[PDB]
Design a binder for this molecule. Structure first.
Ligand SMILES: Cc1cc(CO)n(C)n1
Length: 147
């Protein structure tokens, strides 16, 4: 029926069907469009107190809860999707990763290199697409596939 990992869902508030991807946690009203050795992605990481290393260039001690970190991720996604803010701008300002200084760019990578949930979402994204919240041991990611 649908590309890898997509399924139909029903909006609780509107009754209109939509499409959810259980690998990338993307969700959209439009039916999804249309694997490479390498992909190139950027990401915006929000760390939390249970992160593998609860520190970052933004905060020596990251003390926010996973649920608080998810709410921050949800809000950033909202501003990206509404166009109030660009992914690159938010990543530079708020990503708890060292890649913030490169607007979240991680470069290209193969399978076997990243944390698995991150890897799977990256390779399930189509070029240009952005994930929903992706959970790894580092924290919570918004992933943007650029190549
Ligand atoms: C991790 C990581 C990767 C890169 C380069 O894009 N930075 C700055 N930090």
């Amino acid at each position: 029926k649908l590309p890898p990992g997509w399924e139909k869902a029903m909006s609780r508030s509107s009754g209109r069907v939509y499409y959810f991807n259980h690998i990338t946690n993307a969700s959209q009203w439009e039916r999804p469009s249309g694997e490479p050795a390498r992909v190139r992605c950027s990401h915006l990481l929000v760390k939390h107190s249970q992160s593998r290393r609860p520190s970052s260039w933004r905060q020596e001690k990251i003390t926010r809860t996973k649920e608080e970190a998810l709410e921050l991720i949800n809000g950033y996604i909202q501003k990206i999707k509404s166009g109030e803010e660009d992914f690159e701008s938010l990543a530079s300002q708020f990503s708890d990763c060292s890649s913030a200084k490169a607007r979240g760019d991680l470069g290209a990578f193969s399978r076997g290199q990243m944390q698995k949930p991150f890897e799977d979402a990256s390779f399930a994204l189509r070029t240009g697409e952005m994930s929903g919240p992706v959970f790894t041991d580092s924290g919570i990611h918004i992933i943007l596939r650029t190549e």
